[PDB]
Amino acid sequence: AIATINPTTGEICQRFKALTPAEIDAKLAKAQEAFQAYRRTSFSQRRQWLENAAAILERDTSKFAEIMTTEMGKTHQSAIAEAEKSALVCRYYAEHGEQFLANEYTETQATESYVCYQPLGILLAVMPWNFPFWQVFRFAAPALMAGNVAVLKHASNVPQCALAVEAILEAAGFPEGVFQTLLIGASQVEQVIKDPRVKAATLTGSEPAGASLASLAGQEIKPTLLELGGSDPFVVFPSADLDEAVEVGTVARTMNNGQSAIAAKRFILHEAIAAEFLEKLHLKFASLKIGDPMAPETDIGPLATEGILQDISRQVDQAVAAGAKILLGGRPLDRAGYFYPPTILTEIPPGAKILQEELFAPVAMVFTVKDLDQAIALANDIPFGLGASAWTNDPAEQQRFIQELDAGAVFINGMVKSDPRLPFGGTKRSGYGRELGLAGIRTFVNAKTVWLK
Amino acid sequence: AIATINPTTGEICQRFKALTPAEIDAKLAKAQEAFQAYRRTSFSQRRQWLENAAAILERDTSKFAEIMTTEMGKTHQSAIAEAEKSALVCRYYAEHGEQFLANEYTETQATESYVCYQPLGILLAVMPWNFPFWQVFRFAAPALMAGNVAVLKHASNVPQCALAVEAILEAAGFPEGVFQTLLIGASQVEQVIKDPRVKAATLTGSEPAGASLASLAGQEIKPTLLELGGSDPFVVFPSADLDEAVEVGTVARTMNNGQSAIAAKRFILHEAIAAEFLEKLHLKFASLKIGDPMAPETDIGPLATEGILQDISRQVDQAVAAGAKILLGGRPLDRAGYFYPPTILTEIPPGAKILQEELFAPVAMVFTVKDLDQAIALANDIPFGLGASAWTNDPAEQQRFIQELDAGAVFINGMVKSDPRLPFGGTKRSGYGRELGLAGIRTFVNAKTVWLK
Ligand SMILES: NC(=O)c1ccc[n+]([C@@H]2O[C@H](COP(=O)([O-])OP(=O)(O)OC[C@H]3O[C@@H](n4cnc5c(N)ncnc54)[C@H](OP(=O)(O)O)[C@@H]3O)[C@@H](O)[C@H]2O)c1
Ligand SMILES: NC(=O)c1ccc[n+]([C@@H]2O[C@H](COP(=O)([O-])OP(=O)(O)OC[C@H]3O[C@@H](n4cnc5c(N)ncnc54)[C@H](OP(=O)(O)O)[C@@H]3O)[C@@H](O)[C@H]2O)c1
Numbered sequence: 001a002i003a004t005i006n007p008t009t010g011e012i013c014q015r016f017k018a019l020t021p022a023e024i025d026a027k028l029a030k031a032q033e034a035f036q037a038y039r040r041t042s043f044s045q046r047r048q049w050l051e052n053a054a055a056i057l058e059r060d061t062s063k064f065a066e067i068m069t070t071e072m073g074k075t076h077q078s079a080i081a082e083a084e085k086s087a088l089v090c091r092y093y094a095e096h097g098e099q100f101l102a103n104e105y106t107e108t109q110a111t112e113s114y115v116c117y118q119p120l121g122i123l124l125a126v127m128p129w130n131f132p133f134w135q136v137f138r139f140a141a142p143a144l145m146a147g148n149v150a151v152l153k154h155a156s157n158v159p160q161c162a163l164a165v166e167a168i169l170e171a172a173g174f175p176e177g178v179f180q181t182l183l184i185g186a187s188q189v190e191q192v193i194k195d196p197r198v199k200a201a202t203l204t205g206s207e208p209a210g211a212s213l214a215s216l217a218g219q220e221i222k223p224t225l226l227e228l229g230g231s232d233p234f235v236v237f238p239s240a241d242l243d244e245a246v247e248v249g250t251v252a253r254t255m256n257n258g259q260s261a262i263a264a265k266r267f268i269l270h271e272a273i274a275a276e277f278l279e280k281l282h283l284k285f286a287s288l289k290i291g292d293p294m295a296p297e298t299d300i301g302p303l304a305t306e307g308i309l310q311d312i313s314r315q316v317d318q319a320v321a322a323g324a325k326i327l328l329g330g331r332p333l334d335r336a337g338y339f340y341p342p343t344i345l346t347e348i349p350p351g352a353k354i355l356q357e358e359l360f361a362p363v364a365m366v367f368t369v370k371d372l373d374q375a376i377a378l379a380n381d382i383p384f385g386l387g388a389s390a391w392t393n394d395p396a397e398q399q400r401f402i403q404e405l406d407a408g409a410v411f412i413n414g415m416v417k418s419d420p421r422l423p424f425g426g427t428k429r430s431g432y433g434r435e436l437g438l439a440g441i442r443t444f445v446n447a448k449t450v451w452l453k
Numbered sequence: 454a455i456a457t458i459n460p461t462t463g464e465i466c467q468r469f470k471a472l473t474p475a476e477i478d479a480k481l482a483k484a485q486e487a488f489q490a491y492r493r494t495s496f497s498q499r500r501q502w503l504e505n506a507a508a509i510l511e512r513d514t515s516k517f518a519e520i521m522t523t524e525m526g527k528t529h530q531s532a533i534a535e536a537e538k539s540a541l542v543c544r545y546y547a548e549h550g551e552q553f554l555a556n557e558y559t560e561t562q563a564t565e566s567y568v569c570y571q572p573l574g575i576l577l578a579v580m581p582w583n584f585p586f587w588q589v590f591r592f593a594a595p596a597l598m599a600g601n602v603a604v605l606k607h608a609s610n611v612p613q614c615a616l617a618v619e620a621i622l623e624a625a626g627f628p629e630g631v632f633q634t635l636l637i638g639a640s641q642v643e644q645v646i647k648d649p650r651v652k653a654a655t656l657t658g659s660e661p662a663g664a665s666l667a668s669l670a671g672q673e674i675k676p677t678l679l680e681l682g683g684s685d686p687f688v689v690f691p692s693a694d695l696d697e698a699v700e701v702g703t704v705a706r707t708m709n710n711g712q713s714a715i716a717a718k719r720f721i722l723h724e725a726i727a728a729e730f731l732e733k734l735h736l737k738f739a740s741l742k743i744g745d746p747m748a749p750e751t752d753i754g755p756l757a758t759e760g761i762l763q764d765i766s767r768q769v770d771q772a773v774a775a776g777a778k779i780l781l782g783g784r785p786l787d788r789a790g791y792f793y794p795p796t797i798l799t800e801i802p803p804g805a806k807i808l809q810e811e812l813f814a815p816v817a818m819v820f821t822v823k824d825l826d827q828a829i830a831l832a833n834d835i836p837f838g839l840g841a842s843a844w845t846n847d848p849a850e851q852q853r854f855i856q857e858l859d860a861g862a863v864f865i866n867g868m869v870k871s872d873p874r875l876p877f878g879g880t881k882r883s884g885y886g887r888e889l890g891l892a893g894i895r896t897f898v899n900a901k902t903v904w905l906k
Contacts, residue, residue, distance in 0.1 A: 106874055106890070110867075115876060115890075118856075199881075211672050218667030218677065221660065223885035226674060402569075402903055413906035414563075421559055423568060427899045432653075432676035434900055437559070437568075446880045447887055450855055453866035 002156045002183050007073035007302040008292060008337040016159045019184050024191055027180050031122045031149045032197045034177025039119050039147040043098035046145050050094035052172035053141075057087035057133075064133060064164060066294070071158045072129045072304040073338070074256050075293045079133075086137035092420035093441060097145030100441045112452040117445040119147035124192050124201040126153045126213055129304055130259045132161035135204045138418070140169070140179060142441035149178045151198075153189055155205075157305060193217055200224065200444050206358075207429060225433030225443055227261070227425060229358045230386030232416060233379035234264035235401065237372075238272040240391035241413065246280040252389065252415040254288060254342060257301050258362035259308070261430075262387040262409075262416045265359050267366045268375050274368045278327075278346070281364065285328050285342040288362075302337040303361055309338040312361035319345060319354040329363070356382060372400055380406040385428035387416035408434075455609045455636050460526040460755040461745055461790040469612045472637050477644055480633050484575045484602050485650045487630025492572050492600045496551040499598050503550075505625035507543035510536050510586075517586060517617060519747070524611045525582045525757040526791070527709050528746045532586075539590040545873035546894060550598030553894045565905040570898040572600035573652040577645050579606045579666055581658040582757055583712045585614035588657045588680075591871070593622070593632060595894035602631045604651070606642055608658075610758060646670050653677065653897050659811075660882060678886030678896055680714070681879060682811040683839030685869060686832035687717035688854065690825075691725040693844035694866070699733040705842065705868040707741060707795055710754050711815035712761070714883075715840040715862075715869045718812055720819045721828050727821045731780070731799070734817070738781055738795040755790040756814055762791040765814035772798060772807040782816070809835060825853055833859040838881035840869035861887075 004013040019027070057064065065079030074082070093100075101117040123143050127135045136152060143150050154162035166181040182192070186209065192198055193216045203213045204227040217224045234252060236245050252264035269277050293301030303309045313332050320326055329343030343363040348355060359365065369375045379388060387409045390401035398412050408426045409416055418424045423434035433443055457466040472480070510517065518532030527535075546553075554570040576596050580588045589605060596603050607615035619634040635645070639662065645651055646669045656666045657680040670677045687705060689698045705717035722730050746754030756762045762785060769783050782796030796816040801808060807818065822828045832841060840862045843854035851865050861879045862869055871877045876887035886896055 108872065108874055113875060116855075120880070200885075207674060211674060214671030214674065215668045216671075218669075218671035219664050221663060221667065221679060221681065221882050221884060224671065228674065398905065402905075403571075407901070408899065409902040409904070411904045414904060417904075419561065421561055422566060422902045422904070423900055424902060425900070427573070427901075428652075429674050431674060439900065446861065447876055447878070447892065448860070448880075449862040449875045449877060451862070451864045451867060451870075451875070452851065452855075 030177040035149045047094045049173040050090045054087040054090035056168050069293045073301040082134045086133045089420040090141045093141040093145040110451045120199040122198045123148050123150045126203040128205040129155035129158045132158040136165045152181045226431035228431040230261045230384045231265045231382045232387040233266045235268045235390040237270045237392040239393040245391045248415045250284040253364050254362045288342050302339045322352050324348045376404045383429040386426040386430035483630040488602045500547045502626045503543050503547040507540040510540035522746045526754040535587045539586045542594045542873045546594040546598040563904045575651045576601050576603045577654040579656040582608035582611045585611040589618045605634045679884035681884040683714045683837045684718045684835045685840040686719045688721045688843040690723045690845040692846040698844045701868045703737040706817050707815045755792045775805050776802040829857045836882040839879040839883035
């Protein structure tokens with residue numbers, strides 16, 4: 001079950017043995033001991049080690065990117081970008097961690113009254129295959145800067161990525177036990193959450209996994225953060241810069257072979273520009289290059305696993321049988337590896353099941369609306385609420401989109417992106433809590449109120 | 454089940470009918486409609502209504518206090534104080550809510566990039582009988598200032614308090630459906646958390662209730678905050694003002710008839726001062742006036758319920774049977790009402806079960822220690838970590854207590870108290886999240902990242 005299976009060829013490359021319950025317990029004993037020493041290290045020391053990690057990532061972007069591409073199919077170029085972004089968040093918290101965690105004083109009758117910020121202890125992180133480096137470093141950099149230690153349960157299909165991350169942090173100088181990768185199955189996460197030494201947990205992934213982790217953690221009185229799926233709207237109104245919206249919209253839907261929680265999944269087009277936008281989108285998708293993700297000319301690699309392929313294939317077939325129209329694509333390719341083509345679906349019947357589902361593949365759903373009220377209602381008519389993008393140069397419309405779109409992030413005239421400098425997270429069924437910015441490092445600390453007479 | 458039973462006399466005073474499932478659903482439908490309009494009200498409007506609520510509390514502290522004393526037995530004077538504190542938190546968020554929720558800008562290449570703070574929707578609050586006004590206003594003031602609406606499930610033994618809080622907010626001018634009291638049992642809370650319109654939940658109370666709420670909320674991908682029990686240490690070292698420590702320590706253990714999560718529960722005394730401290734504590738406890746909580750000279754009223762009385766009686770009897778020494782008290786009083794006397798237990802055998810339990814009654818456990826290392830280890834040798842108090846005038850000792858006590862709040866030379874101006878919350882099995890200060894109002898909002906090209 002824990003194995004590298006190359007999605008370009010379907011070949012099983014490397015298998016790994018899962019930890020036994022005793023071995024998990026041993027890793028946790030080591031983490032606990034490591035935490036006792038690590039919480040006493042200086043911010044200067046942690047900064048040095050994080051900067052070292054950033055430098056390792058910066059130096060070997062291509063090597064790390066090749067691991068990511070091999071294991072889960074994203075283009076080598078996009079994996080290089082992922083390695084760079086991972087270094088970026090390391091540097092961000094190296095640079096800002098101390099100031100972000102400094103005492104905050106409040107004037108009272110006390111001689112001293114303030115809040116200080118101390119680490120909780122061992123944090124469990126459960127992470128997904130789609131950004132196998134970035135999701136890990138997004139969590140790890142602030143967690144470690146704050147003085148926590150971490151155990152990582154990565155997706156079972158990216159074990160080499162999981163081991164690589166641990167190795168980078170060891171090479172950077174972080175003490176043994178400060179960051180450990182657990183080669184374990186989803187069924188074994190319960191043992192970790194139930195362990196008295198584990199103080200908190202974070203999960204990035206899908207709802208079933210997050211519901212399981214958060215319910216178990218809640219039962220144990222442990223705080224959580226969940227970053228789950230999205231069906232983000234990409235709304236285009238008549239005053240939009242249409243050519244830019246088409247180009248950026250195409251990237252947003254097709255990046256990471258469509259496998260992004262913040263992909264543009266539902267294109268919502270004002271009737272006045274819908275025909276032009278849709279033609280241009282159609283043309284853009286029609287000429288994307290599908291193939292070997294190691295080849296620099298490739299736009300679209302294979303989907304990450306056979307299951308991901310079967311899922312989208314089923315979802316699209318069912319929508320089409322219900323009366324959705326296929327403008328482009330809409331069937332898996334007859335070639336080795338888990339290839340699914342760029343696809344555009346239109347005229348989706350009201351109440352079609354697909355309208356409520358996340359399409360984790362390069363498959364655009366397209367909608368025409370008459371006005372702003374309709375656009376907002378449709379954009380929000382999903383269980384999720386992660387990101388949203390809207391395109392308009394009318395100030396009043398911009399403000400309505402900002403205020404009224406039910407999402408954790410609203411981007412005006414650009415595609416949704418995470419950036420270390422700003423917090424990032426979901427609402428509704430997309431989760432809760434915020435990674436990145438100040439929020440990221442404040443999540444897994446004891447905010448201890450101190451009052452000295 | 455939902456009833457006023459006067460703990461001073463045992464008299465059943467008023468019975469209330471629990472809402473049916475349909476009636477709960479109707480209140481949630483109303484809350485959802487109310488939220489749509491309420492989220493659009495201005496901060497100046499919310500400030501007016503909250504200040505009105507504060508003025509209502511301020512004007513009728515004695516009337517409200519009598520309800521509290523009647524239902525749950527705290528002294529009328531302490532209930533007056535509770536009503537005053539409830540007004541204080543109302544004014545705090547009325548005064549600060551707008552600035553606390555203002556856009557926070559971060560410089561990037563975007564023309565505008567910032568975080569804004571918008572309400573989630575319907576919040577569920579589950580609250581305990583021990584501070585039946587304060588715990589409610591602690592949650593409600595910031596929740597309402599933020600533009601959320603709230604449904605309250607109060608303890609089944611304080612229904613008059615629960616109805617009173619709703620009535621105050623109605624009289625203050627908050628629209629119908631913005632704050633509603635749900636006269637429902639513990640078993641009906643599941644229906645509320647599972648309702649799709651309910652977006653988040655907070656609970657103040659004990660671990661079993663907290664675990665149930667948080668596990669259910671987690672399963673539904675809904676954020677929570679838990680404020681649970683404590684077994685707070687009260688550490689007294691040789692440089693302390695011993696007389697002040699005795700006086701304050703007595704108040705901390707016996708306030709609210711011992712029924713406080715932040716009571717001083719475990720007195721940890723340096724051997725150099727232990728004999729003098731304990732003599733003085735013994736005399737202070739013995740001098741307390743036990744009787745009718747409506748009488749202004751009463752120090753100790755009855756415990757809130759027959760169950761609370763039975764719990765402490767059993768816990769203490771079992772400790773004594775195991776070899777713990779009764780220095781004072783340690784048996785229920787032979788009189789009408791649920792009276793249990795101020796009690797001091799010493800020489801508790803190592804590994805006695807009581808060492809790990811919360812004593813929700815005026816029962817002090819007392820320990821002698823040789824040094825700071827021993828004091829810290831003992832103070833932290835509990836599942837809880839809510840507050841901690843330490844008494845010393847040695848700066849180095851002060852810093853060790855501040856750094857090393859595993860608690861959400863550390864008070865030096867004073868008893869632990871919540872104050873609207875500072876965040877308040879637990880760690881370990883005492884919960885997570887923070888009420889009060891800036892944190893309180895930031896808990897139940899969508900921190901929405903906005904990026905405009
Ligand atoms: N909001 C964000 O920042 C964000 C970002 C990226 C991705 N995502 C999400 O990631 C998803 C894509 O990955 P996916 O669908 O393969 O996610 P997934 O199945 O939920 O897997 C994510 C992680 O959870 C584990 N897992 C699965 N079931 C579990 C359970 N019952 N208990 C504990 N752990 C469990 C997986 O382990 P195994 O591999 O061993 O099963 C993996 O480590 C998207 O649907 C999107 O929702 C969200
Ligand atoms: N950290 C803090 O700020 C703080 C402050 C004050 C008190 N406390 C805690 O409050 C407690 C005092 O009251 P208590 O011991 O009687 O608390 P409790 O039993 O936990 O009751 C608190 C609330 O939870 C409800 N409840 C009980 N079981 C539930 C369940 N399974 N699901 C949903 N709700 C449930 C109760 O309703 P019913 O009455 O209908 O059973 C009540 O409304 C103390 O033990 C202390 O731990 C903490």
